[PDB]
Amino acid sequence: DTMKVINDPIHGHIELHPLLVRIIDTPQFQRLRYIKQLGGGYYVFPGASHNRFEHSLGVGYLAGCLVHALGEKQPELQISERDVLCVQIAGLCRNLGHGPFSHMFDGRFIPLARPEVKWTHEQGSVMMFEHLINSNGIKPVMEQYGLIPEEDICFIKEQIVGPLELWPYKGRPENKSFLYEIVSNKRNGIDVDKWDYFARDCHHLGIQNNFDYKRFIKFARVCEVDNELRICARDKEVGNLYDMFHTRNSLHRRAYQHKVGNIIDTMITDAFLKADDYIEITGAGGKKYRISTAIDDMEAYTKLTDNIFLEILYSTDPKLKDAREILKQIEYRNLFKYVGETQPTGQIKIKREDYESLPKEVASAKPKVLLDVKLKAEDFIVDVINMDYGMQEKNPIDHVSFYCKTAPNRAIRITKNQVSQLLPEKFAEQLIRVYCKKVDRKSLYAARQYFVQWCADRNFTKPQDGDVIAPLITPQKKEWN
Amino acid sequence: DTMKVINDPIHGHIELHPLLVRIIDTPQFQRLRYIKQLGGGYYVFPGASHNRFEHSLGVGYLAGCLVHALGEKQPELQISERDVLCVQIAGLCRNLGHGPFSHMFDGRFIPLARPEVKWTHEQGSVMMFEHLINSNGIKPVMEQYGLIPEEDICFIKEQIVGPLELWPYKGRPENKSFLYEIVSNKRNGIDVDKWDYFARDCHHLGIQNNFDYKRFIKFARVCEVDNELRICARDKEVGNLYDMFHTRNSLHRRAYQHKVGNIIDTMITDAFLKADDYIEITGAGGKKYRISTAIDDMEAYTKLTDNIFLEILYSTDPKLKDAREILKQIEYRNLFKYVGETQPTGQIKIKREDYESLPKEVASAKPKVLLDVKLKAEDFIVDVINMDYGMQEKNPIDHVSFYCKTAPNRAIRITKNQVSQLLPEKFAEQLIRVYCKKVDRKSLYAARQYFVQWCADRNFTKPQDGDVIAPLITPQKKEWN
Amino acid sequence: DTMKVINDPIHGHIELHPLLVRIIDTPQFQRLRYIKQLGGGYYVFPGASHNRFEHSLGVGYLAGCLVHALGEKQPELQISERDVLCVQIAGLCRNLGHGPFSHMFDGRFIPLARPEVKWTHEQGSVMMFEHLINSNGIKPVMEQYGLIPEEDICFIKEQIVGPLELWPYKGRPENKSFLYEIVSNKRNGIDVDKWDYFARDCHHLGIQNNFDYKRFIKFARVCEVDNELRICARDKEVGNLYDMFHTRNSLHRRAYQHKVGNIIDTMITDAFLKADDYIEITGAGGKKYRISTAIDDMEAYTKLTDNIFLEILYSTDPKLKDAREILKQIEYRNLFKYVGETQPTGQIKIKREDYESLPKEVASAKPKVLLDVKLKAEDFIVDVINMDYGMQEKNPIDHVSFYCKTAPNRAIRITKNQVSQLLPEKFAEQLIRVYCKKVDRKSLYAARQYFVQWCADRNFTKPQDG
Amino acid sequence: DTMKVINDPIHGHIELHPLLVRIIDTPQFQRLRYIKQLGGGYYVFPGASHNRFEHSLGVGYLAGCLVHALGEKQPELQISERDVLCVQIAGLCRNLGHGPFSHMFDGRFIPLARPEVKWTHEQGSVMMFEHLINSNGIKPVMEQYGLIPEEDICFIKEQIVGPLELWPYKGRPENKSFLYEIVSNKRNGIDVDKWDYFARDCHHLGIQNNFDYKRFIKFARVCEVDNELRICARDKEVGNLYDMFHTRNSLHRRAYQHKVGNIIDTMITDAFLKADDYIEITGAGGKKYRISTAIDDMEAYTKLTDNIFLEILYSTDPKLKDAREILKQIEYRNLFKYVGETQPTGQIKIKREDYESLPKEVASAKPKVLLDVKLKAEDFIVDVINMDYGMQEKNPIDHVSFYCKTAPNRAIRITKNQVSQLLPEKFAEQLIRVYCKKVDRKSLYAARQYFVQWCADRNFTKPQDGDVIAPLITPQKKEWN
Ligand SMILES: Cc1nc(N)c2ncn([C@@H]3O[C@H](COP(=O)(O)OP(=O)(O)OP(=O)(O)O)[C@@H](O)[C@@H]3F)c2n1
Ligand SMILES: Cc1nc(N)c2ncn([C@@H]3O[C@H](COP(=O)(O)OP(=O)(O)OP(=O)(O)O)[C@@H](O)[C@@H]3F)c2n1
Ligand SMILES: Cc1nc(N)c2ncn([C@@H]3O[C@H](COP(=O)(O)OP(=O)(O)OP(=O)(O)O)[C@@H](O)[C@@H]3F)c2n1
Ligand SMILES: Cc1nc(N)c2ncn([C@@H]3O[C@H](COP(=O)(O)OP(=O)(O)OP(=O)(O)O)[C@@H](O)[C@@H]3F)c2n1
Ligand code: NA
Ligand code: NA
Ligand code: NA
Ligand code: NA
Ligand code: NA
Ligand code: NA
Ligand code: NA
Ligand code: NA
Ligand code: NA
Ligand code: NA
Ligand code: NA
């Protein structure tokens, strides 16, 4: 058990402490080799073959970089080797809870399969970390390297999911508050997890990363702000932070919310739903779970990866025929067809509980156009996407503190108007995409007229292509011209 | 004279037609090897050693890529080899008019040295091109390769500077209107010149380029818009175009308007002004010109490059002592000191004719603080920066036309609200930076009080570090807290 | 059916003709999404998650770039749109025959599972291409776009596997000879397939690519050489070609033959062998095949991918326990243990047909040392690695033709001595690595003594680390 | 001062200690902004605009990286902050002695202008460092930061040039021997200076770097070898070190010895020689120096940069006409024409004293061919290039020591045959290029016949194009087949 050096295409030669190596070399961690970072995105961007495993190594790496840099510049913070290891472990382990095709699983499949349960990848990561520790005898190894497992396990979990229940954390005291801002920053979202995915996703997607995390690290300091020690940025770096969030939004627009990538995730989800009654996953004590219930038993969940897609695709069981056929149609590129995109106007914000009513609404629209085919609710898919700066309607830069060159330990606030008038006025929006499951030319024509009529009825924005797809519907709305 | 291959670190292996090689291998073109692309920026970003020469090769290259792509996808446009060569030549030659330290010359020095003249690098490029053609016997070579010099020289100049002044161009007819949108796009600023400098400046600065010009080319088409053939983008590329302009603005913020780079350009300009009566540049017929009059004689201007800085720095003439001393202080990094930055609020805009009144205004401010030193007008520099999307207050994307996949010959418009609510609400602003020529601690303290008081008096934005630099001044303004 | 644009991180925005899209959007092609390019290498280089699919797109792309460039510079070659499409198709389809974990399958598993059969990924690619065409109704689509399936299918297969057996090809005549040097260059190995994998593997591994393929394309021309039209390089580029091969050898040394990646491929192969009676793959007419017999039915082979590893790993059947346990030990990083390395001396080379006798040989060695444990044949792995410039002992640059700037239609040869005295004197060598499946300290000690004795018996080089 | 951050395109965000900033901000250091790293190479590779300044920053950076890494892993070496600063200063300052166009100056111009003197850039760097320190009051600043100038200046100079006259060094004792292997490694050439130029030259040239220096650092240790502490590599790195030298040789072949770049350096050298009697450079006490004598006065040398090229090019003095005309012909790309390349056969180098006899020999060749025009010795340029692995005929890897991970304190040797049979058999060779100053087609034809005949007469290798350029001459030589 000495340190290992690993060559990563993003970060280069990265050192892994032997405790980290012990954690990595387990079935619970290695599982992440079989879960694509971007899920259905690979079916649009063929470079995006990268998995959650290598992203996890990068996050643990960068978590160590930031905590080491803070400690080197400010010995007065009393950051210990124990603290550094705990932060690196949380960075390494904060992706353990992801399921097949990453956000497809927690974002689309579980909400539909198990609408009563409240599952997040964060909670999954806590449960899987616990399973990893207990199944692999990691506690005596933590101890060997100076950790105190009771307190430090708690600290690691809290970094992943937040307070496990006035300073709300139990794993560390307030004087180490800043340590909770490294791995998953619940105050403003500025964390090393974003820095790794920006660089790594860009490298694989073939889109170029404009955020410089190493610069950020160089300019980062810990300061007291309203009685608490926070990571603060240099004042003049504020434009770079606005640009960090702009980068995140552009990656979502270009890649993660690609309209075809989304429909592929939707089809895969549909296949998994049709397969869920028939695939069995053996868990603890030989008990049997489903795709949708493996989340209840970490032994079963350990065996739940992107393999499920191929188990379905390669199946011969007649009960899996309908699931298998959806996947086959993905392979033939016989996809549900994209009809268009619109946005709500104003403060209007469509809620998750209304999502199911939307396809009916589209099908109930009455376009004043000559139509052969008539479409029903079940022929439409309506995908609602929330785009924001990570704090719903809030500006995350209002939740950052800065320091000046003349007083580096003295935290200040910077308002948006002190920065630029070219910045966003709003920090959250919704995109609404409509697709049609009938793919012939007459059905697509019809779907376009229902869609643009529905936009007009709901006072949503004019589709970008609306004059071309629905020339007889767009003139009715004077707000559109 | 066959086709020559050149290896460029941005574009790779580029082919140059023999006519282009003939144009490049002249003193008028080769001059651009001695003019830094980013001028004083090298003194802040040590990677930014690149010159106007290699940028020009890249612009010529990309101009050819775009015109070739358009011709290949749309044979009906009747783009000829002659058209391709003329576009490549304009792309190659549109930087011929730059002077020492590029934007320092036309942006700072000429306005101060020759306030009566209206000089632009574009006009310079036309004059230098004409000089290059006539001095090197290029016309019979244009002819050899199928160009018609009268029409084609006119066409090339018009691409560079616009109409030489109802269709206002003489070099080509309206059926080739789109050709004028390649090299210098006066309609919306989307041109190949930006594409080269984004990539090349980023390469040298150590900042990563987020705009994909090759994608843009792939999706570009020519469509009829209001009776004219224009280059149009695919509808779904609109976000990428908003991002192109965001990229340009971020490069200005991080690099081109760096507060120290600007003060260095200011000092160099001051040295050139103090040198201008004494440096001689020999032009046509042995006539002598000054730095400020070389623009009147292309033979003298051919010899006016960044060398002027070293001629001053290395001089022994006592008449050049004052100019030389400024440059010496740059080498010792004894720079004028940055006092702070502010912005006017709203649509309020300081104009070029007011620039000279500003240091007097700062010096006339009456901070209610005990001050040891008192400062005069001549102790202050006030640098006003216009940041915009290239069309003053206008949104350039309102001046782009798009096409849809279902009707690729049908041009449409797309409004900002049809795209995203996270986009800029304004497309222009001004930054005001103040510096002090006296660099001792008491003078800098005093300068900061005058500055912040002036900001408060004029209702400009609170300096980002205002509470730290001027804690007794910031409390007066309740909007600042 | 218009052109599609696809964004690749290596090549950028690549255009795909609609016929190519039709070929790509099949189960036979899409399968390649589930086969890692570098197999076991991912378990050493965590960036090496890339699959054969994206590599195939890149090869099709570069095949089109080269044939287009040649056509543009030399209209006299009469390269047609039909020729361009056929070259792009061969480039796209020359990886169809790869099996689970790529070289693990054809290099390690099939030789052990089916020692009587003579399988290559090239032959596999031809069989899978034919399966793809016939199962998906591609022929009437080729016709719609002006291809002639009889001649063109033949031409595509020949680009992949060589003559299907005087000009030995049937798909094109000798006046289009040069077209056969693009996708898989059997004359000297300079082909677009290498160019894509250098760039793509380097991108994923985190090692930087030395070779400039775009330069090569720019300087490539077709010239008559001994009555045949061949792709020739500019004379001045000869150093760059020696460097192309050096690049290939460095990628093998650093990555593809990494000693840990190799032992992982060896363990996976061992798990597949132990699983082979129990994993079932359904083929044509509902017939069932094994991992080792899926190659006998393309419908079954279509469903044979890296998934097999997870099917084994996630299995609960006691019949699969031994296979499953090997894969489990990979996850715990409990690997078969490296014992040592040696080389034959001179041009001496151990041949593929002797590979299976080698572990028995090591186990039969009689070291004159005090040895506690005794080991059997099945406890040893002996991995023979051929490092060469792609033509066994030959210098591939002796099989390249060049042209000079003063006579661009005149092909010449360039010898090694005309280039540099710093070049390799030899173009092939063999490395022999030995590992032990018993990993305790006494067994490893013993394995080392048998190994060094075997080296002495065979007159191999003295192992390092005495 | 505090710590300054500089953004470098190769290394990213680099920290400079304030003592380093004081050294950099001097006329003697800033001078390196005006000296191209690759000289005439820019006239072939337009990306190669980079100067000695930014390379020096990178070398100082990497010198600090390596010495820091060694100290962190091996506290027993007693590397002090003082040692780290001294190593960084030597790294920073080891390019101070370069002259106009870098290797053109010490490699071509000084040998011809001052054949009696033995000038090297290393000696120049020592003299310039001394001048920098004394002219800028650096000693009291060294002292402020804990350095001891007497010992430490000596140490810095010794790192640059080697022993200034049994352990031969005075700046540090034998127990810090390894510190002399960082900046300029005279034992085997493995130093940080190569690592910076590999990366930086590749970035600018547009050729990709295949050497990973960060990996090397990770695997580097100090071990005792034959009673001395040396930097040693892990055993596994041996292949990578052979490849590092292969990389260096390939960069020389592709770029630094480009046949056209070399002829351009030759023409510039010729221009400088013709200018040398007439250009004046003012040195200490107003004394005047020439281009060839500025090396004798550091105050004059401080003002001797690439500017000399433009001073000549822009001159009007009739005495400079002949120099100026050569430079003008470079601008028109009227270059001496490349005739061909050959190599000597067998073992003994052609020596420098025979170089002058070579053009005569070529002109005296008697090709048995009909030739109308006849050429003289002075129409030929013969450029002899020594290509090697940095230790003449020796294999530098025979001078590296390695360690195995289970015995990291035991240094061993690894022989070529223990690595691969595919490695070079020889480590040094000569390339001979011939050019003709007469550029018409009949003269070039003739030059080619003389050249190939001369190759045959001297038993040199067959030119690659020999059968095409000289079809009547190549049949005579049975060794050519
Ligand atoms: C850039 C580069 N170049 C190499 N020559 C090279 N050799 C191995 N790697 C990569 O380094 C990482 C460490 O592999 P490495 O081979 O250095 O270490 P090992 O653990 O196999 O050997 P040992 O030190 O235990 O004896 C791995 O991600 C990958 F192999 C390399 N990466
Ligand atoms: C990446 C790379 N690799 C090379 N081996 C290499 N050799 C030359 N270059 C670069 O190519 C460009 C063309 O140089 P090249 O040497 O091909 O042109 P030349 O004019 O010297 O030869 P010729 O055709 O007239 O006989 C130039 O920018 C630079 F030399 C290279 N770039
Ligand atoms: C660098 C870059 N930037 C983007 N904004 C961007 N958007 C899509 N891509 C990528 O281009 C490729 C084409 O995607 P694209 O979105 O252009 O094609 P589509 O088939 O969805 O649209 P349509 O023309 O059929 O309406 C794909 O590999 C990936 F989606 C992008 N790549
Ligand atoms: C990648 C990147 N992004 C930036 N936003 C950015 N701003 C400055 N730089 C670059 O960092 C380096 C340091 O610039 P910086 O502006 O941090 O230093 P300063 O000396 O002007 O500020 P202060 O600390 O004295 O107030 C320099 O090489 C260049 F300006 C940037 N580089
Ligand atoms: Na920052
Ligand atoms: Na910014
Ligand atoms: Na224009
Ligand atoms: Na100059
Ligand atoms: Na056939
Ligand atoms: Na072939
Ligand atoms: Na079948
Ligand atoms: Na699977
Ligand atoms: Na290259
Ligand atoms: Na190394
Ligand atoms: Na190597």
Side-chain angles (χ1 to χ4, degrees), chain A residues 206-212 234-240 242-243 246-247 249-250 253-254 258-259 337 341 343-344 346 387-389 404-407 410 412-414 416-429 431 448 461-469 471, chain B residues 202 206-212 234-236 238-240 243-244 246-247 249-250 253-254 258-259 337 343-346 387-389 404-407 410 412-414 416-429 431 448 461-469 471:
Chain A
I207 291 167
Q208 266 210 89
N209 178 16
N210 184 243
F211 180 63
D212 189 336
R234 178 77 190 275
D235 54 355
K236 74 181 185 60
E237 304 297 297
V238 57
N240 297 334
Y242 279 97
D243 282 348
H246 177 96
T247 291
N249 185 67
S250 172
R253 285 285 193 148
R254 295 175 181 184
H258 188 276
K259 69 225 208 278
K337 296 300 298 174
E341 183 184 73
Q343 302 191 255
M387 307 283 277
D388 59 48
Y389 276 26
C404 51
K405 170 186 185 179
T406 58
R410 177 168 146 204
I412 59 163
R413 299 280 189 197
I414 303 175
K416 188 178 70 160
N417 292 162
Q418 295 180 269
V419 186
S420 169
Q421 318 309 125
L422 275 35
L423 295 170
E425 268 201 332
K426 211 169 167 317
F427 298 93
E429 64 183 344
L431 304 180
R448 288 154 165 168
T461 59
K462 183 181 151 199
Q464 291 175 357
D465 59 351
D467 299 326
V468 172
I469 62 162
Chain B
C202 282
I207 289 169
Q208 183 132 268
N209 179 18
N210 52 20
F211 182 62
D212 191 337
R234 181 75 190 272
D235 54 356
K236 74 179 206 298
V238 62
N240 293 338
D243 284 348
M244 192 196 87
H246 179 102
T247 292
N249 183 67
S250 87
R253 285 287 191 148
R254 293 178 189 189
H258 188 277
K259 68 218 208 294
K337 291 305 213 164
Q343 302 189 257
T345 50
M387 307 285 281
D388 61 48
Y389 276 30
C404 311
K405 169 187 196 191
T406 59
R410 182 173 171 208
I412 59 165
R413 303 280 183 189
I414 302 177
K416 189 182 61 149
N417 286 178
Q418 294 181 271
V419 185
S420 172
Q421 319 309 125
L422 274 36
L423 294 171
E425 252 59 311
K426 289 218 307 227
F427 297 94
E429 63 182 343
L431 310 179
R448 289 157 168 205
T461 60
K462 183 192 189 182
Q464 292 178 4
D465 60 22
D467 302 322
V468 184
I469 61 151

Side-chain angles (χ1 to χ4, degrees), chain A residues 149-216:
Chain A
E150 324 87 88
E151 295 173 33
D152 289 338
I153 287 167
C154 172
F155 178 37
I156 296 163
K157 293 169 170 176
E158 285 173 335
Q159 288 178 77
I160 299 170
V161 75
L164 303 189
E165 72 107 32
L166 298 107
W167 179 243
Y169 289 105
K170 309 295 194 217
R172 289 289 186 282
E174 201 160 28
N175 54 288
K176 299 277 186 85
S177 50
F178 61 90
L179 293 180
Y180 291 95
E181 291 167 30
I182 295 178
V183 174
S184 176
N185 181 330
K186 315 298 195 216
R187 173 163 318 280
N188 55 44
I190 301 169
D191 52 52
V192 299
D193 178 83
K194 286 185 177 60
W195 300 350
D196 184 77
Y197 81 72
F198 289 172
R200 189 174 309 273
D201 295 349
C202 283
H203 183 83
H204 284 93
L205 291 161
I207 291 167
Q208 266 210 89
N209 178 16
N210 184 243
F211 180 63
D212 189 336
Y213 89 78
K214 288 178 189 190
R215 182 178 175 85
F216 183 96

Side-chain angles (χ1 to χ4, degrees), chain A residues 69-312:
Chain A
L70 290 178
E72 294 289 301
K73 272 170 257 142
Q74 289 180 282
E76 75 273 13
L77 299 168
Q78 306 188 200
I79 295 169
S80 67
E81 190 46 47
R82 179 174 156 219
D83 292 334
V84 171
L85 276 169
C86 288
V87 166
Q88 288 171 305
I89 292 166
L92 264 191
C93 297
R94 63 154 285 173
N95 282 280
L96 285 173
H98 274 292
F101 298 84
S102 292
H103 287 275
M104 197 205 85
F105 193 76
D106 62 325
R108 297 177 183 280
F109 174 74
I110 291 297
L112 287 170
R114 275 181 80 194
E116 86 290 345
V117 102
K118 301 297 101 138
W119 172 260
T120 64
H121 71 253
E122 290 92 338
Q123 296 166 77
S125 297
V126 166
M127 291 165 75
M128 184 61 60
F129 178 63
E130 176 70 15
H131 181 55
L132 186 167
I133 292 312
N134 294 335
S135 309
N136 295 281
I138 300 300
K139 295 189 204 183
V141 193
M142 288 175 156
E143 290 181 332
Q144 174 183 357
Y145 291 106
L147 273 50
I148 301 174
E150 324 87 88
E151 295 173 33
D152 289 338
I153 287 167
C154 172
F155 178 37
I156 296 163
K157 293 169 170 176
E158 285 173 335
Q159 288 178 77
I160 299 170
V161 75
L164 303 189
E165 72 107 32
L166 298 107
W167 179 243
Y169 289 105
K170 309 295 194 217
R172 289 289 186 282
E174 201 160 28
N175 54 288
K176 299 277 186 85
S177 50
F178 61 90
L179 293 180
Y180 291 95
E181 291 167 30
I182 295 178
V183 174
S184 176
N185 181 330
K186 315 298 195 216
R187 173 163 318 280
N188 55 44
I190 301 169
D191 52 52
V192 299
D193 178 83
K194 286 185 177 60
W195 300 350
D196 184 77
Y197 81 72
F198 289 172
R200 189 174 309 273
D201 295 349
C202 283
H203 183 83
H204 284 93
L205 291 161
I207 291 167
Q208 266 210 89
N209 178 16
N210 184 243
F211 180 63
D212 189 336
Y213 89 78
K214 288 178 189 190
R215 182 178 175 85
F216 183 96
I217 295 178
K218 291 275 195 245
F219 288 84
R221 285 185 70 85
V222 173
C223 309
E224 186 198 326
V225 182
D226 307 330
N227 292 308
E228 201 184 285
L229 290 189
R230 309 267 182 79
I231 295 177
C232 296
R234 178 77 190 275
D235 54 355
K236 74 181 185 60
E237 304 297 297
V238 57
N240 297 334
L241 271 24
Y242 279 97
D243 282 348
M244 193 196 89
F245 291 96
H246 177 96
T247 291
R248 179 174 172 277
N249 185 67
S250 172
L251 293 172
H252 274 275
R253 285 285 193 148
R254 295 175 181 184
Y256 315 138
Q257 305 304 336
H258 188 276
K259 69 225 208 278
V260 181
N262 284 8
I263 204 56
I264 291 169
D265 276 344
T266 299
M267 295 173 73
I268 288 172
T269 293
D270 282 348
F272 277 27
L273 289 163
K274 290 185 168 88
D276 193 45
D277 297 332
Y278 310 115
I279 291 189
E280 291 199 325
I281 300 119
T282 305
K287 297 184 175 287
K288 332 304 317 316
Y289 290 88
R290 298 184 192 203
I291 301 163
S292 57
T293 58
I295 60 173
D296 303 317
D297 181 69
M298 290 300 102
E299 188 170 328
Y301 200 54
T302 295
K303 305 160 75 197
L304 188 75
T305 62
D306 296 1
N307 154 84
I308 290 301
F309 175 105
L310 296 172
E311 183 171 3
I312 299 166

Side-chain angles (χ1 to χ4, degrees), chain B residues 374-389:
Chain B
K374 255 89 216 296
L375 296 173
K376 319 156 240 281
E378 59 260 15
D379 300 324
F380 290 101
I381 287 143
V382 183
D383 204 21
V384 177
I385 297 143
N386 293 312
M387 307 285 281
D388 61 48
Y389 276 30

Side-chain angles (χ1 to χ4, degrees), chain A residues 324-384:
Chain A
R324 177 168 69 245
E325 279 300 321
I326 289 164
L327 301 187
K328 287 185 163 171
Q329 295 315 305
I330 297 176
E331 300 204 298
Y332 295 120
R333 211 75 178 182
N334 183 20
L335 312 182
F336 303 155
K337 296 300 298 174
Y338 173 71
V339 178
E341 183 184 73
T342 187
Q343 302 191 255
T345 47
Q347 104 288 228
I348 289 101
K349 189 190 146 60
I350 297 173
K351 287 257 50 68
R352 167 154 275 282
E353 79 247 29
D354 295 77
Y355 287 4
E356 185 147 307
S357 70
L358 304 173
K360 283 133 294 302
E361 279 174 37
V362 175
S364 302
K366 319 299 278 296
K368 300 190 84 188
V369 181
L370 188 58
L371 288 183
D372 176 11
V373 341
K374 89 74 53 62
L375 297 169
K376 316 168 246 294
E378 65 218 327
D379 301 325
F380 291 98
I381 288 145
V382 183
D383 198 24
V384 177

Side-chain angles (χ1 to χ4, degrees), chain C residues 234-236 402-408 410-414 418, chain D residues 259 337-342 362 367-371 375 380 432-436 441-456 461-476 480:
Chain C
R234 182 75 190 273
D235 54 354
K236 77 199 321 299
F402 298 88
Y403 70 88
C404 311
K405 171 181 168 173
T406 60
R410 181 172 171 200
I412 57 165
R413 300 281 178 188
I414 301 175
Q418 296 180 269
Chain D
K259 68 224 185 273
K337 301 300 301 169
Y338 172 74
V339 182
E341 181 177 43
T342 189
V362 173
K368 268 59 179 183
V369 183
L370 182 96
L371 295 185
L375 297 164
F380 292 97
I432 303 164
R433 286 81 172 274
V434 175
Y435 307 80
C436 190
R441 83 146 167 91
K442 299 176 308 170
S443 290
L444 246 298
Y445 177 86
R448 288 157 172 162
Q449 311 310 298
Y450 288 99
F451 170 62
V452 176
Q453 185 59 53
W454 179 65
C455 291
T461 59
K462 183 183 163 208
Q464 292 172 3
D465 60 349
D467 302 321
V468 174
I469 63 167
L472 309 165
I473 309 296
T474 60
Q476 88 186 253
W480 299 355

